[PDB]
Amino acid sequence: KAVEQGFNVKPRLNYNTVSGVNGPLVILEKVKFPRYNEIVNLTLPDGTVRQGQVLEIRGDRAIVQVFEGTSGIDVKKTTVEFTGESLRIPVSEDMLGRIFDGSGRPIDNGPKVFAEDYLDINGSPINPYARIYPEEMISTGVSAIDTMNSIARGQKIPIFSASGLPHNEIAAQICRQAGLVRPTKDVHDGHEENFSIVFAAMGVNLETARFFKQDFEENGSLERTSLFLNLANDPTIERIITPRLALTTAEYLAYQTERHVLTILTDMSSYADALREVSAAREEVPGRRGYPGYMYTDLSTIYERAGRVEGRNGSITQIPILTMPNDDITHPIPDLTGYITEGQIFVDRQLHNKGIYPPINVLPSLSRLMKSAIGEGMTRKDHGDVSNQLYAKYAIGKDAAAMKAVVGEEALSIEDKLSLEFLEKFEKTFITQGAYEDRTVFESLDQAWSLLRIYPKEMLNRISPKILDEFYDRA
Amino acid sequence: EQKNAGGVGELEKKAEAGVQGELAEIKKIAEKKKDDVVKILIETVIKPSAEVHIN
Amino acid sequence: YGAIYSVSGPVVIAENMIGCAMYELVKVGHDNLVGEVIRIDGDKATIQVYEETAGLTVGDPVLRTGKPLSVELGPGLMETIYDGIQRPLKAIKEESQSIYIPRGIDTPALDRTIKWQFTPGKFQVGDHISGGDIYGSVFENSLISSHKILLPPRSRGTITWIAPAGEYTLDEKILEVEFDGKKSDFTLYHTWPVRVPRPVTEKLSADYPLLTGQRVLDALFPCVQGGTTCIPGAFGCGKTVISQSLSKYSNSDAIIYVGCGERGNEMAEVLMEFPELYTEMSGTKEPIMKRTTLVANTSNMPVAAREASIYTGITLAEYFRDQGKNVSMIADSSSRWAEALREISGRLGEMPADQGFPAYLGAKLASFYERAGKAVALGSPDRTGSVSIVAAVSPAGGDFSDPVTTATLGITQVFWGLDKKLAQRKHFPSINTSVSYSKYTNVLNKFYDSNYPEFPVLRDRMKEILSNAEELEQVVQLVGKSALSDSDKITLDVATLIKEDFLQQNGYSTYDAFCPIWKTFDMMRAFISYHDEAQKAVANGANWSKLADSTGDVKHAVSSSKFFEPSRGEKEVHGEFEKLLSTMQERFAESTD
Amino acid sequence: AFIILDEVIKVTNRRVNAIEHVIIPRTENTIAYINSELDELDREEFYRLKK
């Protein structure tokens, strides 16, 4: 149980052989046995220390990406001391409650985290056999989410969002209202009904940072959150490791302390931008839109560190906000996130223009494991069929609206007119939700039924007839 | 609002007492454990580890 | 012998590696991470390292192995989960109690400690033997009983010693053949390079349908044991339903589910799912995990593992084809594999051709698919095996412009393409009955003419109705249903009835979870005869609005015919359908007057 | 029939004037401007790699 293995001193080789520096990556020469991923404490001529990371060794050369930017570095006087080990965040259970800078330095007035263990930021693959399927639903309170895109505890589910949409408000609301639909107990103790959020603001403007900080203060979550802030004016390569730092603290928190954690990663489009910058200063072969070819793997390594594990009571839910650019899903960032993360919440611009909050668009939204956290014994019996019916009639209503625009209202059958009415009432009374509404899934389903009762019973064809005969006429 | 505003002095005092208990406990633990901690750490920082890294 | 000279991720450029062959396994680093060369430049040899390369340093030994990426075939892999490189995941968890797969973990792919019963088979001492000749039989499960162990395809010679019946672990010397003077020593398992197809004597024509359960799949676009398909990979239904249906009911004597690039939680679902699928399988209710390997490969796992995942899966499937078992290989999300090829080329540096995909994507898909033949095994005794790919293709944002789907369309005989509109309507399964196709419609006629003679005519009628009515709908949605003739109204309405009650299929209820072929044929007959009766009746005087009102009972009967519980057996379900069709005909004859 | 002919004639005119002549520039954009531009950028990146 003792970690006394750490009482050994390894003197660190200190170079002065910076061959050259371009963009964000310095290049080093005459290194003696470089390690591929060891971080480097290169010191500028000013005496300040910038923490780099070796990016690709080659013989006696080691291309080193430099966090905190390369401005001010030089050749004659820059000294690059090699730490022998990969980047290891000092992790502890005491980080809960204070704010960390992007690269793990505590910008809180408190001291450095008095770590009881050093976890590699890259983590390790969780043996898929040892993984356990996340089936416990969490009631996010957002009726547009719980009813039709239910987030289950352990699921990955990014909030895709246009630039300028209120994705931050939605994420703050989900933090405020998170909770299992059928918790262990009513009391705070024993049930552990509080997610210990681990929020990683990366490439966010300072207004978003203040918004999240004060929204966690007001909710009281700031006593159990580790805000990894990396603001806009903060460096641009530090955004590479901020998500990894947040995920490895979340892993410590969930798997090694049996705590329940909800790990938001804000503005991961900025993470993709940082990755593009590094891999375009590397002269790599670029992918779809100049992004690195390997984006799929170095985004999966960010995402796929989520989900429950056999034998450990912890679980890492994560909701990586994703500022999809130009508002097209097929942009390689959201397109390569839809691959990895099961489902996505699509925050939609034209619904926001009509004033709906939250502006969540159902049809592009999905939750690839919503199908198992529903039904009997967990939430209401009719949840699965009601969700399908709402989706189908929303799609029908949108098609009817498109036809009405193209062709006059005459060509619309009675079904299309009913669907237009349903879509109007849907977007106006069900998707629409106050910033503090906190609609429990049962009253969300009651609203869904009072909405679907527009149609005749013979026309809710995707509802199983038993569910119809049992719920439709209750009123 | 008046009741909450005047409670800053009382709440800060109670929190300061609560933190002072733990601070005293930490100081008491350190005062007795630092001898052994320094004895182990001095040996760790003084013991050589002459080795080549070719393998 | 060797030494690392560069690291750039999975790419690790060794040196002093002169003599190494291309695509040859080469342990890397002191942790002995497993990697394979992909380019040789004099001494150097660019290695993709199949692992988390962090921690490698120049000078780290890279010791060759001289064997291409090999899958450890043999008994013991029937029930087990495997990683992409054929790492037994459960064995890793047992030996290393932690929940993490350690870097460079050796664990033999097959359980060595298990002692399999073995029977000597046919060949005796002094008898000549050839590659693929069955020389034994091991009782693996109650469901893969008599797992006929067979000689490695390449090796041959005369037998000098064959072990008698008994129990043997994996390594025990089972057979000792002699070629020239060098007598090879054979055991109960044999490796095989995953990159080369397991050779067969002759590839026959796949001509027995792979009953997949979904009504539209078995009827409109049938697939054949030994064929190849593209399930659309959509969430909810399509891929999800077809996977379990072909797992439980498709009569495939063995199965390999290779989930390349599949999201981790989805695999965690699969792993907690397959052990629980004996609910309705034939025999005496044995779990199908006794009858299916599955090659789990989450996306986070390194790139080359995703690339080699389906190669391992298809080599296992070829092995189970060489024993005469009608294996089916459900390669889930091969688009993720194509993405793995794209990014491994990107790391390698070669110039991509289409959308960043490598140029040889078409050839690589062709090599992966054309190992799907129904073929006779290589050696005596003659035995007919058949492997049938089912390669899910995640469609991404695009519909078919994605080059993986376009390159696949030129290879797969069957393509159950997705329909976005049917998905937005939550119409499951949501395959597109206008752009899907099966080049196996005509070869299956040899099977249809013997069992269900009217099946092809009915399928053609069903397709004709659906296509004519889609043409008609494309106009009525633009104008309106007022001007439609009575025959046009019938075509449109019968198409709606079909698309809602025949093509649609819940796939989860006790009825219609697996629609057997006879029930599907009888419903085809019922719907087509209903359309024929309506068309013939309106060919006479009876206008169609009154006729629909008067035969709403018949319409509801043919619509609810889907509810017929298939577990009642054909003997009485066919009787129900005969009664339905007779009452249908008599009711339409009555309402004609 | 006068009302119906007026509605159908104005629907055909509205089509040929607004709907078709806005869908045609939409596709003209989507391929000729943007898709060609993006292919040009990708070919620039590939030529830089080749260099």
UniProtKB/Swiss-Prot annotation, chain B:
**Subcellular locations according to the entry:** Vacuole membrane
**Out of the domains of life, which is the source?**
Eukaryota
Q: What does this protein do?
A: Subunit of the V1 complex of vacuolar(H+)-ATPase (V-ATPase), a multisubunit enzyme composed of a peripheral complex (V1) that hydrolyzes ATP and a membrane integral complex (V0) that translocates protons. V-ATPase is responsible for acidifying and maintaining the pH of intracellular compartments.
Q: What else is known?
A: Present with 2280 molecules/cell in log phase SD medium.
Q: How does it assemble?
A: V-ATPase is a heteromultimeric enzyme composed of a peripheral catalytic V1 complex (components A to H) attached to an integral membrane V0 proton pore complex (components: a, c, c', c'', d, e, f and VOA1).
Q: Which family does it belong to?
A: Belongs to the V-ATPase G subunit family.
Name of the protein in its database record = V-type proton ATPase subunit G
Q: Which organism is it from?
A: Saccharomyces cerevisiae (strain ATCC 204508 / S288c) (Baker's yeast)
